[PDB]
Amino acid sequence: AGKKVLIVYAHQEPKSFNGSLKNVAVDELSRQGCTVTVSDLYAMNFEPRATDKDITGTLSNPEVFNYGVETHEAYKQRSLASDITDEQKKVREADLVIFQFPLYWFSVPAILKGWMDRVLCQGFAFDIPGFYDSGLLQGKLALLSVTTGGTAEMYTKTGVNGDSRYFLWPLQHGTLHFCGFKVLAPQISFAPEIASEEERKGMVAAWSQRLQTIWKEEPIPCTAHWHFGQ
């Protein structure tokens, strides 16, 4: 209600399963009266590489280029590439940011990692000091919606891949929390390519039905215990 939602989407095919979890998310939040924005990275042809072209202006120190130092500088001078500035503008408005993506090597597809590297710069998403609980994006909610080729069986402490929670750490704690987001419980749709229709349709339902009360939720305790047990 009145809330603004940002969905950063990372999938090349609209007909894909990720596409349906995304459309589902879009229809429901909208149907509820929420303002919804979507960043379909692939269709934007989003630049994922961190380069000096990200700072249009003149560098304070061109002798030894430090992307970290320069983008912090550029942000204060409003001289970051317009594509990054557009995204930061969306994040800044959002009350809720959803990441929709297929797991790639236990992480986010590279194009989305680029979005994280280029969009969450110092001065914008966090300050030193002013990170973790005093991150600059405090007051906002973040949620990861991950689809996997592997199965729930495969993703357990006594399974090959280890409990799926282990690979959420760099993203949930290292990124979102570091920036002040309150982290909601992740949506993990396991092995959709494998499951039958009466499963790929049950997962979606779960996503949809879950989105129906999303504003009802409380963040998770983004700790090592939560992620790795003991």
Ligand X SMILES: Cc1cc2nc3c(=O)[nH]c(=O)nc-3n(C[C@H](O)[C@H](O)[C@H](O)COP(=O)(O)OP(=O)(O)OC[C@H]3O[C@@H](n4cnc5c(N)ncnc54)[C@H](O)[C@@H]3O)c2cc1C
Residue ranges of the annotated binding site for Zn(2+) are: 173, 177, 222
Check binding of 149 to ligand ML2 (CB under 6 A). yes
Binder of ligand X out of 30, 31, 43, 68 (CB under 6 A) = 68
Nearer to ligand ML2, 109 or 211 (CB): 109
Cβ 99 vs Cβ 8: under 8 Å: yes
**Alpha-carbon Rg of the chain, whole angstroms?**
18
For Zn ion, the closer of residues 68 and 174 by Cβ is: 174
- Separation of CA 155 from chain center: 21
Q: Which residues bind a second copy (CB under 8 A)?
A: 12-13, 15-16, 42, 45-46, 48-52, 63-68, 104-111, 113-114, 116-118, 120, 132, 149, 157, 160-163, 166-167, 169-171, 173-175, 178, 193, 224, 227-230
Report which of 25, 127, 19 is spatially closest to residue 72, judged by C-alpha positions.
Answer: 127
Q: What are phi and psi of 226, to 5 degrees?
A: -60, -40
Does residue 122 touch ligand ML2 according to CB under 6 A? Answer: yes
Range 37-55 burial, b when 16+ CB lie within 10 A, else e: bbbbbeeeebbeeeeeebb
Question: DSSP secondary structure string, 81-137?
Answer: -HHHHHHHHHHHH-SEEEEEEE-BTTB--HHHHHHHHHHS-BTTTB-SS--GGG-TT
CB atoms within 10 A of CB 223: 11
Told to check if 114 binds ligand X by CB under 6 A, we report no
Residue 141 CB, shortest distance to ligand X, in Å, is 21
Tell me if 168 contacts Zn ion by CB under 5 A: no
Residue 175 to residue 201: CA distance in whole angstroms: 31
Minimum distance between the CB of residue 180 and ligand ML2, rounded to whole angstroms?
Answer: 12
User: Least CB distance from residue 213 to ligand ML2, whole Å?
Assistant: 30
| By CB under 6 A, residue 39 contacts ligand X | no
H or E element that contains 76: helix 67-76
Is residue 222 close enough to count as binding Zn ion by CB under 5 A?
Answer: yes
Pick the closer one to Zn ion by CB: 131 or 215.
131
Residues in region 23-82 near ligand ML2 by CB under 6 A: 68-69
Note the residues at the interface with ligand X (CB under 6 A): 11, 15-18, 20, 64, 66-68, 102-106, 117, 147-150, 174, 192-193, 197, 200-201, 204
Residues at the site binding Zn ion, with contacts judged by CB under 5 A: 173, 177, 222
